[PDB]
Amino acid sequence: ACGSCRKKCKGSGKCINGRCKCY
């Protein structure tokens, strides 16, 4: 469950707690 969190964070990202944070 992320919602294109990888594209939003184009590359290595994180999608948890309903929050998409990038690395």
Distances, alpha carbon 22 to alpha carbons 9, 11, 19, in Å: 5, 8, 10
Residues in the chain: 23
Nearest to 2 by CA among 11, 12, 16: 16
Let me know: does 3 contact 15? Beta carbons within 8 Å: yes
What technique determined this structure? NMR
Distance between alpha carbon 22 and the CA centroid of its chain, in Å? 6
CA dihedral over 10, 22, 5, 12, signed as positive or negative: positive
Nearest to 2 by CA among 17, 11, 12: 17
**Which distant-in-sequence residues (6+ apart) come within 8 Å of 12 by Cβ?**
22, 23
